[PDB]
Design a protein around this ligand. Sequence first.
Ligand code: HEM
Lengths: 438, 55
Amino acid sequence: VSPKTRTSNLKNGLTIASESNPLVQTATVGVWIDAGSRNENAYNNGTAHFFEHLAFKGTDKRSQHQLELDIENMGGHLNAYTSRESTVYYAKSFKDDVPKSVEILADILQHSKLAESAIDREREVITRELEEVNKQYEEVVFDHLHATAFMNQPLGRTILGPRENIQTITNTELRKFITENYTADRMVLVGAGAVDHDALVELAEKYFSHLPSSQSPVPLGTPIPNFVGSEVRLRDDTMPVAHIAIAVEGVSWTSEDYYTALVAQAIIGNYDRAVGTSRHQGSRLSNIVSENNLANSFQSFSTSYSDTGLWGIYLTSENTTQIDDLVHFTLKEWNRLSTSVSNLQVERAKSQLKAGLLLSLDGTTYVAEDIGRQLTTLGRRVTPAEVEAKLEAVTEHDVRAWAQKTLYDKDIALVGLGPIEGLYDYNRIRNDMSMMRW
Amino acid sequence: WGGFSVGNPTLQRFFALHYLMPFVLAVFALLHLIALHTAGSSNPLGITSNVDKLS
Ligand code: HEM
């Protein structure tokens, strides 16, 4: 039984949330923000990611060099990432270096210079990032997947933004973005590891008290996406491995079917030929794929956003003449979530998930990430007892009913990259979303 | 004819051959398709379709 997550607020509406672990000597403090690329329009798309670069380029007090030195002297590191719906800035340090790290984070968020000289310098760095993501195939596949599934909608945009915007982002629009979005009612100060809650609340009162509040404070994790069944093919015969993602519209964080979608995802599960145990996994798709050498790997996913999600699978394969079999067998396993699953698969997946949801949190950064994610998506940290009860509530009838309305005979978004000549056209893929025998 | 003019022998043999010949025709129709399968169908532009196939 893990220690209780303590939660306090300031007057501006900044949440402070902490989970102490007296067995570790490091601490992760940081700021989770309920804001990301999805808050940009088409003209300033790329701003949030641009800011993340400039946040480390110097503040009104410390210059770029002083900032570098200050963190080096702390002993730990700082890290940041911007996603579609969430931005994070955190600092891992020693137990007693926590007040320094809170002070540095408060500085780079509130008091960053955003000097025209630095904007102009990063404008080239970010331009080079556009031509080097090209190598991270999983990311290429998932960014095309969002672009097509949410065609011409904010969730469909990339985080980097178009080349055109990178050349035209000004310090004005950067400042406007962080003034509109980085407000106290959208922010959570999180501490995990060797942190005292009462100490962290004091540090928040010292550094984050002059944060603007938004005019209309909605609750944390408050959002209309119209999924497009569609396909992107990026054939490249010179690549040896095909990367394929298939997804349907999934569930939001606060859906009533959130746990049902996780259980369904665990029934298919993951596979990787490089792991020794993977040939012995219980999943039917795992057995088909391993016995027939259809794939190097597959990874089921159920990605959630505030108002939508994507549920699907990501496959990698060198077997270029049997891509058709791989896709066929995968979608016939999805069909069985509608037609065939019983208490056998459901109770096995529940067993595996009851542990999996706890196992994931195995270090201070994972704990901080869990507190921050849950506070910015649900407005509260959900206790493991509540999670165990929501999983236990999932029956085989729930899984069948969910799959029948979410998967069965539904449109998919499909992305293929690499030697995908053997991937059939959209209709033949989408025809495997149902079974004529049922 | 089976005789010195078209008559009963001719009619009975034409019946037997008329019944048979469609089966021979079906075999040759199958042969020309198996022969075609090595190149595939041509197309109205006259170029290769190996770049862009549909089931
Ligand atoms: C019982 C008579 C026949 C049947 C059932 C038949 C059936 C077919 C079929 C199904 C195809 C493939 C689809 C198409 O292109 O239309 C085809 C292609 C072809 N047939 Fe026929 N056929 C017959 C008679 C003939 C005759 C009399 C010729 C030539 C004098 C011929 C020459 C061809 C050729 C060259 C092709 C390939 C055309 C291409 O796709 O570019 N067939 N036939």
